[PDB]
Each structure stands twice: as C-alpha cells, then as structure tokens.
Amino acid sequence: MLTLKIFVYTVVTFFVSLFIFGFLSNDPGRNPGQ
Amino acid sequence: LVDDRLAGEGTGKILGINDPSLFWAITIVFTIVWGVFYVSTREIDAASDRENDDDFGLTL
Amino acid sequence: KLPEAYAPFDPIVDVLPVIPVLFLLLALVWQASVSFR
Amino acid sequence: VAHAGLIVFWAGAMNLFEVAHFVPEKPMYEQGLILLPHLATLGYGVGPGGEVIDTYPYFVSGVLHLISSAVLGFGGVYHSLVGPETLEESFPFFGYVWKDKNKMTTILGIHLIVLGLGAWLLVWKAMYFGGIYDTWAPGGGDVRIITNPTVSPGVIFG
Amino acid sequence: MLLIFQLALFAFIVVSFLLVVGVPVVLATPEGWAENKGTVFSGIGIWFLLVFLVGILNSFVV
Amino acid sequence: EWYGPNRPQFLGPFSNPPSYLKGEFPGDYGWDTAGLSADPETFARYRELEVIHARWAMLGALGCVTPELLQRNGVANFGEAVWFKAGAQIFQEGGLDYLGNPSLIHAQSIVAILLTQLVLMGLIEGYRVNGGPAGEGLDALYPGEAFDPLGLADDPDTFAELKVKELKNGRLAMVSMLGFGVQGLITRKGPIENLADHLAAPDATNFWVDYAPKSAGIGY
Amino acid sequence: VSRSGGWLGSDSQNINLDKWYGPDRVLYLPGGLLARDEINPVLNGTLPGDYGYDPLGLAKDAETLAKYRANELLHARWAMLAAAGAIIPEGLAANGADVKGATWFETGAAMLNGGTLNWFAVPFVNFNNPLPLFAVVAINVALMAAAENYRRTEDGPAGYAPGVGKFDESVYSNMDNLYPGGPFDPLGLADDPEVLAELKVKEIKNGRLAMVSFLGFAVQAAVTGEGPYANWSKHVADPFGYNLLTILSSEDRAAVL
Ligand code: CHL
Ligand code: CLA
Ligand code: CLA
Ligand SMILES: CCCCCCCCCCCCCCCCCC(=O)OC[C@H](CO[C@@H]1O[C@H](CO)[C@H](O)[C@H](O)[C@H]1O)OC(=O)CCCCCCCCCCCCCCCCC
Ligand SMILES: CC1=C(/C=C/C(C)=C/C=C/C(C)=C/C=C/C=C(C)/C=C/C=C(C)/C=C/C2=C(C)CCCC2(C)C)C(C)(C)CCC1
Ligand SMILES: CC/C=C\C/C=C\C/C=C\CCCCCCCC(=O)O
C-alpha cells in the first residue's frame, strides 16, 4: 500500500509541477496579437 | 489485530507525508522539472524579440 | 437595550441599516436624472 | 474612501440596531445577532459561563463606528466630487501608473505593514488589555489572559 | 443634566441632517465650493463641538 | 626626539632600524624584524589597524578594571563583577541592571541587544570609513573637528607629542588586555583578585610556583 | 572636505529647503481647503516654522512679528527644558530609584522645612545635595538675574568656551538676539546654511510640541491629581479603563442589562 502511495505522489507532483512551470514560461505572450 | 494498515486517516500530517520516501519523491520530481525549466528561460524570453528589462511583460 | 438616557432616540436606530440600499437606489436615481448619457 | 465609509456605517448602524433589540432573558444565538457575538469573543461585557453581564461597550463601539463613518464619508465625497481628478502631477507621492511595477509594489508593501500592525493589535488584546474569551478555560469558559502562545514552527506549519 | 444632554443630542442630530443634505449641494454647484466655504467649515466645527460635548455629558447621565 | 634619525629605538644603544622606517610616524621605535611592513600599502594598513586596536584596548582595559574595583571596594553591587562573566548576567532572573539598581537599564533580551548593536555599530563604522554627519573628507585616523571639541591638539608639535603619548598608552593597554585574557584563563579569577593575592604573599602567589609544576601531567 | 554629510551612505543628504521656505512651503491647511492667497502678507515664508497660521490678525507688521518670534523662541526653549525635567525624574523614581519629590508639582513643597533634594547624576551616582531652601533660592535668583540681564544688555564678561576658546568681552558684538552662535555653539553644527535652516525648523517644531505638552501637563495635574508619568503608565496599562471619560464619572455605573 505504501508503494501505491509513493507512485501516486510521484505522478501527482509530476503533473502539478508541469502545470506550474508551464504557466510560468511566458504564457501571456502566446497570443495572435499584433 | 487481524490485519495491518497504514493507519493515517484523521491524523493531521504535513502534506500527508508519513514517510521520508514520499518526501523524497515529491522533492526529486519537483527539482527535476524545475531544473529542466530553468535552462530554457533565456531562449523562451528571446522569442518575443525583446529584452527582459523593467518594461517587460503584458502591460496595459 | 439602549441606556435610559438614549431611550427617546430608539426610533432613529430602528431605521438606520437600510441606508446602504438607499445609497444604491440613489445612484440609480442620479443616473436616471442625468438621463443615462 | 466613500465605500470604506459605507462599510463602517453599516458596522456601526447594525451594532446599534442589535444592541437596542437585545433582551437578557434569552441567549445571544436565540435573538438573531451576528455582530454582538464578535465582541463577546473579545471578552467585552461577558462573564463566567458565557452570560452577558454588561451592554455599554457594544454601544460605545457602535457610536465610534458611526462617527468615524461620518468622517470617512465626508472625505470620500470631497475626493470624488471636487478633489483633483488625476493626482499624478500635483501629488507625485500618491500618484501612480497601473503599469509602473515599482509603485504598485510599494503600495502593496505599505498596506502589508498596516495589516501586520492590525494583527499585532489583535495580539496585544489577548495579552495585556484584559484578554479574550476562552471557552476551554478550567472551571467553565471565562475571559482569560494568554501568557504562553504557541509559536512552534511545527505547530504553525501543521 | 439629563435634559441638557438630550437637547445636545437633538442638536447634534439636526446639525448632522443639515450637513448631510447641504454638503453635496454646495460641492456639486459650479463655483459654489469656492465661495461658500465658511458655512461648511462652521458647520463641520459645530458638528465636532457637539459630538465632543455629547461625549463629555454622557459620563454624567450613564 | 620621537622623530627623525635621533629617535629612541626599541633595543637601546644597539640601534639598527630598517630602511623603510625613517621615523615619520608616531611610535616608530624601529622594530620590524619580520619584514611585514616592507610594502608601503601594507604599512599604512598596519598603522591604521594598530591605532584602532590601541584605542579599543584602552577602553576595554578601563571597562574591565572599573566594575570589579567598585564591587570589591563595596561601593556597588553587580550580578557578576568579573570581566569574563559580565556577559552572562542577561541570563539571570533579574536581567541586567546597570550598577545594580533596577531603574537604570533593566535589559532583558539578548536578541534586541544583538540587533541594536549590529545596526548602530555598522552605521558608525561606515561613517568612520566613508564619512558621515561629522565630516566627509577628514583624516582617516585623526579626523578632529567634531571629535576634538576642546582643542588640545592644535599646535603641530603638540599634536605629534599627543600622538606619541596616545600610541604608547594604547600599546600598554593592548599588552595589559592580553595579560587579562590569558591570566584569567589560567587562574579563573579577576585581575584585581589576582593582584590582591600576589600582594598578599608575593613569593607564594605567583605563576611559576603555583601553576608551572602542574603544567605537564597534572591538573591545574 | 566638509563638516556635514548624509546619515545613510554616499550622497544621502538631499536637503529640501523649498518645503519649509518660499512660496511652495507647506501651510497649516491642505491645498484643497485654503488657497495661498488667504495667507497674511507679512508671513512671506522667511522665518523658520512659518506655516502661515495667523487667524486673529496678530502680525500687524515686521516689528510685531519679530518681537513675537523672540518671545516664541524663548518660550519654546523653556518648554523643552521643562517638559524633559518634569517627565524624567518621575519615571526614574517610579521605576525604582530613590528620588524625593519626583512629581513636578511637589518638588517645591519637598524642601519646605528641612527637606533636601537628592540629585541623580544618571547613571553613576545619586548625590545628597545639602543646599537649604534659602541658599537655593538666593543662588538661583542671582544666577538667573545675571544671565537675563546679560541677555537684554547684548553684552557679557570674558571667559572660555570649547570650540571658540578664550573670548573677551568683544565676541558679543554682531551676535544675534536669538541665534547668537559662537560660544553657545561649541560643536559647530551651525556651519552650513541649509543645515542651519533645517535645524531651526526642527527646533521650532519641537518647541511648539513641548509647549503643548506642558500645557497638557498642567491641565492633567489640575484635573487628575497625579504626575504625568502616572497618567501615561496607567493609560498604557488600561486604555479603555483609565481615561478622561472614566475619570470624570465620580461614581460607578450600574450594569446595563
Ligand atoms: C557590525 C558592523 C561592523 C562593521 C561593518 C565593521 C566594519 C569594519 N571594522 Mg569594526 N565593524 C563593525 C562592528 C565592530 N567593529 C569592532 C571593532 C573593530 C576593530 C578593533 C577593528 C575594526 C575594523 C573594521 C574594518 C575592517 C574589519 C575586517 O576586516 O574584519 C575582519 C574579520 C574578522 C572576523 C575578525 C576576527 C577577529 C580577530 C582575528 C581576533 C579576535 C580575537 C579574539 C576575540 C580573542 C580576544 C580575547 C582577549 C582579548 C581576551 C571594517 C570597516 C578594523 C580596521 O580595519 O581598523 C583600521 C579594526 O582593527 N573594527 C567592534 C568591537 C567588537 C564592533 C562591534 O561591537
Ligand atoms: C485613504 C487614504 C486617503 C488618501 C491616500 C488620501 C490622499 C490625499 N488626500 Mg484625502 N482624505 C481622506 C483619505 C485619503 N486621502 C479622508 C478620510 C479625508 C477626510 C478628512 C480626506 C480629506 C482630504 C482633504 C481635506 C484634502 C485631501 C487631500 C489629499 C492629498 C494629501 C494632501 C493632504 O494635505 O492631505 C492631508 C489630509 C488629512 C486628512 C490630514 C492628516 C490626518 C492624519 C494623516 C490622520 C491620522 C489618522 C490615521 C491614519 C488613522 C486612520 C484610521 C484608519 C484605520 C481608517 C492626497 C491626494 C488634500 C489635497 O490637497 O487635495 C486637493 C486636501 O485638500 N484629503
Ligand atoms: C527648566 C529647567 C529645569 C529646572 C528648573 C529643573 C529643576 C529641577 N530638577 Mg530637573 N531636569 C531638566 C530641566 C530642569 N529641571 C532637564 C533638561 C533634565 C535632563 C533631561 C533634568 C533632569 C533632572 C534630574 C536627573 C533631577 C532633576 C531634579 C530637579 C531639581 C534639582 C535638584 C538638584 O539637586 O539639582 C542639582 C544640580 C546641579 C548641581 C547642576 C549641575 C549642572 C552642571 C553644572 C551644568 C552647567 C554646565 C557648565 C557649562 C559646566 C562647566 C564647568 C566645568 C569646568 C566643570 C530641580 C527641582 C532632581 C530631583 O530630584 O527632582 C525631583 C533630579 O534628581 N532634574
Ligand atoms: C500553496 C502554494 C500553491 C502554489 C500553486 C499551486 C497550484 C495548484 C494547481 C492545482 C492543483 C490541484 C490538485 C492538487 C492535488 C494534490 C493535493 C492533494 O490531493 O492532497 C491530498 C493530501 C491528503 O493527504 C492525506 O493525509 C492523510 C493524513 O492527514 C493520510 O496520510 C493520507 O494517506 C494522505 O493521502 O492532502 C494534502 O496534501 C494537504 C494539502 C494542504 C494544502 C495547503 C495549502 C495552503 C496554502 C493555500 C491556501 C488556500 C488553498 C485553497 C483553499 C480554497 C479552495 C476552494
Ligand atoms: C460619490 C458618489 C456616490 C456615493 C456616495 C457615498 C457612498 C457616500 C457615503 C456617505 C457616508 C458613508 C456618510 C455617512 C454619514 C454619517 C453620519 C452623518 C452619521 C451621523 C451619526 C449620528 C448623528 C449619530 C447620533 C447618535 C449618537 C451620537 C449616539 C446614539 C444615538 C444616535 C445614533 C442618534 C453615489 C453612490 C451617490 C453615486 C454618485 C457618486
Ligand atoms: C550542504 C548542506 C546544506 C543544506 C542542507 C540543509 C538542510 C537539510 C535538511 C533536511 C533534509 C531532509 C528533509 C526531511 C523532511 C521531513 C521528512 C519526514 O517528515 O519524514
């Protein structure tokens, strides 16, 4: 059961870190504005 | 008892971490993603053809 | 209850809290009088 | 400023309305009061066991709030009607531009300092100015004085 | 002393009502704020004096 | 004297000053046997270090002898009169009271003392090395002006004489402070107590007889 | 080379005299409540501390303004000294020191029959001043009379002061009636016109604050009946339980409901 907890924690933190560091990567500049 | 269980419900642990293994998993994954993101920030900023001075950003 | 010295002014207290709603209505009335320019 | 005056006006008027409709033969929660229990938890006009003993502090709080609301409302009306329209040329200290990051950060810091002072003002009440109502006090709930607050990082982070 | 305190409170109420109805009218007229400043200043001073007097007199009636 | 080729030397009649010690600065007795001041820049830095150390040592020696003397004479009463135990009074129940009465300082926290000293001393030392309220372009070591209220050093010759006297007194203070430290370390007693014990029985109370035989294989 | 500088590093003085002198100086009312044309023409922003506050037309011309400024400066300095010496000994004695007649409105009564006034040379030694009442009054009267006669004469004897040095009876020539300087300024802080002007403004503001403070001291002594330090200590201990309104109520108030 602890192995499942470790695996789920790893997956969740991976996806949340992807979300955070993607929204930090100059997102308000990816628009078709002139 | 008859069986065994984690027995962590309703305890009040910080971030639910009852194990240094969980702490290490969180820290290692976060650090890996941050390190991959860190080196590309100079290239990503240069895609807007502007310098990251005090006037940078989306402003109105 | 209010102190004995403030008893005659009880009716004034009973109507105070509606004044903010009256203020919103007054803003609408002012806009109407200005003719919604 | 006018909106802040409106908020203070509602606070004072509602406190006066609730203090004028309060009977001592019923508990606070049985009479539809929501502002009076806030002052009771601060240790104002309450006794052992949770029985209301005095009422004058509630009246004082309401009157002070109402008069301060009058002052704030006058200030807001002045600044909205006949005050300067754009205070970036006559009052450079108070003037700002939405796109000037440094000025916005400075204003944010000033208001953070003000909020921290407010939190410390709350802290001083429970220590030196009579304390606050403690419902877990030995021998029934009563207005205690907090002498040993828990400032342990493990407790706060928990 | 009670009658004096009640008279002071009534005077405070009427002065507050006069200020509430008059200050926006004075401030919202063209070239009215720049001329009728003395009346508004005297009204504000009387308001403050009345509130201080009522606060002082409250200590004897309560 | 005190300057030029005819100044007194650090060995007496056996005089042999180095080539870079011409006798231009106060306290120049021609003692550089290690060649540590052959570089003029290092010489200037060493001069400033020596003067500052001298002044600090004079203040420290006076502050280490005063409260213990007052307490031993019975004039005053302190929580800890000994110089190497005065810092621990802040951990006592009554706090730190100046000269014993609770109406003078009544210090209670060590963090506040640390932070206030950090801020104040940093500001005043930055003033000293850069210039502040008391001046902007004065001398590095002898600024004068606001720090010489009652002018004692105005004639150039009296200025040099006072420089020499200050340096010699400060050097004596440095030696006394080193003695204080080492000699309270060995004996675990204050300087005044050591002086009284020696003056009681000079032959019996000393360093050699008292502690030297127990300096190898035996406890002190 | 300079005799003054900034307190916060290099190039950190930034003295702004246009805020306290000239046509752009700050007045006693904000710009939206009083135009600059309503100011008395005599108050043209030349003297330090000029806030343009003269409602009851008391500054007829330059001579009256100068006389009132001299009186105000003297009163402000005396108020500084009085406030300090009336607030400090009482707190010293209340914190645990041995001071007789600490309260300011009782020191005179302390030395009435045979009482003696101990002097605390903080923080070193508490003295046992043995001067009796008659000697004290004679010495104080003599010294104050001599000093004030010297002030109005615009001349003085010969002595020695730090900084200036040994001066004869001629240094008093060309000395200002209000800012004499010289022997009275040993540290030489009054050497830069900008620093001198800002110091004058600071002095006049602190003096006005001290005057208001001592008026409050006198009124508090008349009403409450104890020393100014006791009032402050009790109010800080209990803000809502010890103030003017609480003191005024001569009897306890029955509980409201
Ligand atoms: C907190 C801010 C603060 C700042 C920014 C400075 C800044 C400065 N100080 Mg100052 N000081 C400050 C506080 C204090 N100073 C001093 C006392 C001195 C002295 C005596 C001297 C300076 C000097 C200097 C300059 C160079 C020092 C350096 O290179 O570090 C060196 C870094 C070290 C960590 C020093 C290590 C200590 C040293 C090797 C010996 C220590 C010996 C033991 C304590 C044993 C003694 C016990 C015996 C006596 C019983 C520099 C401008 C020096 C200067 O340049 O003079 C021209 C100088 O000589 N300062 C004291 C008294 C304790 C201070 C606070 O209390
Ligand atoms: C909320 C913040 C706020 C801010 C940032 C400003 C900002 C400004 N005001 Mg306005 N004002 C306010 C509220 C505010 N005001 C209120 C509540 C009133 C009613 C009294 C006024 C009445 C007012 C007047 C009459 C004038 C201005 C003018 C100005 C300018 C300052 C110059 C000056 O002399 O004013 C100083 C104004 C003061 C009221 C005196 C100082 C009072 C001290 C600072 C108060 C100490 C109280 C403390 C902060 C506790 C408050 C309780 C809090 C928890 C609510 C500047 C643009 C002036 C300008 O020139 O406009 C053309 C001017 O004419 N204001
Ligand atoms: C407005 C003026 C003023 C007046 C009239 C008083 C009056 C008084 N004070 Mg207060 N005081 C004042 C301001 C004033 N004070 C200020 C500004 C402070 C410092 C913040 C104090 C601090 C203070 C203390 C600490 C004490 C008093 C006390 C008293 C009494 C004095 C008892 C005594 O023994 O003195 C004796 C005084 C002296 C012998 C005077 C010495 C002054 C020296 C000589 C300076 C002259 C300078 C000159 C250049 C020196 C050159 C010579 C050089 C070669 C050596 C008396 C009622 C005492 C008390 O018990 O009252 C309750 C006491 O304990 N006062
Ligand atoms: C605080 C920094 C924020 C930075 C930016 C964050 C961006 C977030 C992006 C979206 C992510 C959403 C999904 C998150 C999934 C992981 C969390 C999870 O499932 O935890 C689930 C775990 C459950 O942990 C359980 O614990 C038990 C013992 O207590 C047992 O051990 C269980 O086995 C264990 O699973 O809970 C936590 O980890 C606690 C999280 C506490 C978070 C406190 C945040 C404080 C600061 C913010 C305050 C405001 C928060 C919002 C409030 C209002 C909301 C309407
Ligand atoms: C600008 C504008 C606006 C707004 C405004 C506002 C928001 C205002 C406010 C205002 C205010 C906010 C005000 C206030 C006032 C107050 C007052 C005036 C008070 C008074 C009081 C009194 C008088 C009291 C009394 C008493 C006592 C003392 C005790 C007890 C009893 C009694 C209660 C009686 C609008 C929307 C219209 C729109 C347009 C623009
Ligand atoms: C090179 C040294 C520098 C910095 C390192 C400093 C501190 C490291 C401290 C802790 C690391 C492990 C953290 C464990 C968190 C708690 C885990 C648990 O609750 O089981």
- Mutation pick from E5, E26, E40, E59 vs chain G, by most beta carbons of G within 10 Å, is E59
**Residue D29 burial (CB count, 10 A):** 9
C11 touches chain D (CB under 8 A): no
Residue D52, beta-bridge partner list: D46
Classified as helix, coil or strand, A16 is helix
Burial of D122 by CB count in 10 Å (0-12 exposed, 13-18 middle, 19+ buried)?
exposed
Question: Minimal CA–CA distance to G122: which of G157, G96, G83?
Answer: G96
Tell which one of B23, B24, B27, B28 to mutate to probe ligand 6, the residue whose CB is within 8 A of the most ligand atoms. Answer: B23
Question: Minimal CA–CA distance to F67: which of F55, F84, F54?
Answer: F84
Which ligand is located closest to the Cα atom of residue D73? 5
Task: Nearest chain F residue to G160 by CA: give it.
Answer: F150
F156-183 burial, b at 16+ Cβ within 10 Å, e below that, comes to eeebeeebbebbeebbebbebbeebeee
Give the relative orientation of helices D56-81 and D2-20 as an angle to the nearest 10 degrees.
160
Separation of CA B22 and ligand 6 centre (Å):
13
Task: Nearest chain D residue to E16 by CA: give it.
Answer: D70
Longest dimension (CA), chain D: 64
Separation of CA A33 and ligand 2 centre (Å):
42
As a whole number of angstroms, the distance between CA E15 and CA E6 comes to: 14
Residues of G in contact with D52 (CB under 8 A): 257
Residue F69, beta-bridge partner list: none
- Residue G161: phi and psi, rounded to 5, are -125, 145
As a whole number of angstroms, the distance between CA G139 and CA E57 comes to: 49
CB D17 within 8 A of CB D62: no
Here the tokens at position D43 are: 């240790």
Report in angstroms the alpha-carbon separations of F144 from D138, F50, G164, G187: 67, 19, 15, 11
Question: Minimal CA–CA distance to G248: which of E1, C1, E44?
Answer: E1
Question: Minimal CA–CA distance to G83: which of G216, G236, G250, G204?
Answer: G216
Here the tokens at position E44 are: 């504000």
Residues of B in contact with A3 (CB under 8 A): none
As a whole number of angstroms, the distance between CA B42 and CA B39 comes to: 7
> If you ran DSSP here, which 8-state letter would residue F132 be given?
B
| Cβ contact, residue pair G253, E58, below 8 Å | no
Here the tokens at position F74 are: 């019975």
Report in angstroms the alpha-carbon separations of B42 from A26, B47, B49: 11, 9, 12
Minimal CA separation from C2 to chain G, in Å:
8
Classified as helix, coil or strand, D143 is strand
| Cβ contact, residue pair E62, D67, below 8 Å | no
G257 touches chain E (CB under 8 A): no
Residues of G in contact with C1 (CB under 8 A): 256-257
**Helix locations, chain F, DSSP H:** 40-72, 110-130, 156-187, 191-200, 208-211
Is the distance from the beta carbon of residue C12 to the nearest atom of ligand 5 less than 6 Å?
A: yes
| Full DSSP string of B7-40 | --TTS--GGG---HHHHHHHHHHHHHHHHHHHTT
Element (H, E) at E22: helix E2-27
As a whole number of angstroms, the distance between CA G78 and CA G72 comes to: 10
As a whole number of angstroms, the distance between CA G253 and CA G236 comes to: 23
CB D18 within 8 A of CB D33: yes
User: Resolution for this model in angstroms, one decimal place?
Assistant: 3.0
List, chain by chain if needed, residues with CB within 6 Å of any ligand 1 atom.
F 48-49, 52-53, 56, 117-118, 121-122, 125, 129, 177, 181
What lies within 8 Å, CB to CB, of D43 at 6+ separation is: D125, D130, D131, D132, D133, D143
**Dihedral angle of Cα G137, G140, G142, G146, to the nearest 10 degrees:** -160
- Residue F107: phi and psi, rounded to 5, are -65, 145
As a whole number of angstroms, the distance between CA G50 and CA G47 comes to: 6
As a whole number of angstroms, the distance between CA E25 and CA G19 comes to: 35
Separation of CA G85 and ligand 3 centre (Å):
8
| Cβ contact, residue pair D13, C19, below 8 Å | yes
Separation of CA G131 and ligand 3 centre (Å):
14
**Helix locations, F73-95, DSSP H:** none
D56 touches chain C (CB under 8 A): yes
Is-cis flag, bond preceding G123, omega within 30? Answer: yes
Question: Minimal CA–CA distance to G88: which of G232, G247, G243?
Answer: G232
Q: Which of residues 1-60 of B touch D (CB under 8 A)?
A: 12, 14, 54, 59-60
As a whole number of angstroms, the distance between CA G2 and CA G14 comes to: 15
Ligand 1 atom, smallest distance to F45 CA? 57
Q: Name the residue facing G253 among E37, E56, E62 (closest C-beta).
A: E62
Minimal CA separation from D138 to chain G, in Å:
25
| Full DSSP string of chain G | --S---SSSSS-----GGGTSSTT---SS-TTT--GGGS-TT--S-STT-----TT----SHHHHHHHHHHHHHHHHHHHHHHHHHHHHHHHHHTT---SS-SGGGHHHHSSSS-----EETTTEE------HHHHHHHHHHHHHHHHHHHHHT----EEETTTEEE-TTTTTT--SS---GGG-SS--TTSHHHHHHHHHHHHHHHHHHHHHHHHHHHHHHHT-S-HHHHHHHHHH-TTTSSHHHHH--SPPPP--
As a whole number of angstroms, the distance between CA F130 and CA F138 comes to: 10
Ligand 6 atom, smallest distance to B20 CA? 20
Here the tokens at position G101 are: 């007649």
Experimental method: cryo-EM
- Residue in the block written with tokens 């060649």: F35
Classified as helix, coil or strand, F61 is helix
Here the tokens at position G60 are: 């007829």
F117 is in an annotated binding site: yes
As a whole number of angstroms, the distance between CA F164 and CA F145 comes to: 20
| Cβ contact, residue pair G6, F132, below 8 Å | yes
Which ligand is located closest to the Cα atom of residue D118? 2
- Residue D142: phi and psi, rounded to 5, are -160, 165
A23 touches chain B (CB under 8 A): no
Separation of CA B12 and ligand 1 centre (Å):
49
Between F and G, how many CB-CB pairs are < 8 A? 58
Tell which one of D3, D8, D71, D78 to mutate to probe ligand 2, the residue whose CB is within 8 A of the most ligand atoms. Answer: D78
Interior angle at CA A20, CA A19 and CA A22, nearest 5: 65
Question: Minimal CA–CA distance to G31: which of D84, D72, D89, E30?
Answer: D84
Burial of B29 by CB count in 10 Å (0-12 exposed, 13-18 middle, 19+ buried)?
buried
| Full DSSP string of D60-120 | HHHHHHHHHHHHHHHHHHHHHHTS-S-TTSS-TTT---TT-HHHHHHHHHHHHHHHHHHHH
Classified as helix, coil or strand, D133 is strand
As a whole number of angstroms, the distance between CA B40 and CA A1 comes to: 38
At least 3 CB pairs under 8 A between chains D and B: yes
As a whole number of angstroms, the distance between CA G44 and CA G62 comes to: 11
Report in angstroms the alpha-carbon separations of C2 from C13, D19, D28: 10, 7, 16
Residues of G in contact with E56 (CB under 8 A): 245, 248
| Cβ contact, residue pair G32, D78, below 8 Å | yes
Which ligand is located closest to the Cα atom of residue D157? 4
Separation of CA F56 and ligand 1 centre (Å):
10
Is the distance from the beta carbon of residue D13 to the nearest atom of ligand 5 less than 6 Å?
A: no
Interior angle at CA G85, CA G83 and CA G87, nearest 5: 65
CB E28 within 8 A of CB E21: no
As a whole number of angstroms, the distance between CA G38 and CA G64 comes to: 20
Element (H, E) at A11: helix A2-23
As a whole number of angstroms, the distance between CA G187 and CA A34 comes to: 66
E36 touches chain D (CB under 8 A): no
**Residue G93 burial (CB count, 10 A):** 20
Alpha carbon B57 to its chain centroid, in Å, reads 23
As a whole number of angstroms, the distance between CA E8 and CA E56 comes to: 11
Minimal CA separation from D20 to chain E, in Å:
16
- Number of residues in chain F: 220
- Residue F132: phi and psi, rounded to 5, are -145, -135
Separation of CA G121 and ligand 3 centre (Å):
9
Classified as helix, coil or strand, F45 is helix
| Cβ contact, residue pair C5, E13, below 8 Å | no
As a whole number of angstroms, the distance between CA F82 and CA F98 comes to: 14
- Mutation pick from D56, D64, D124 vs chain G, by most beta carbons of G within 10 Å, is D56
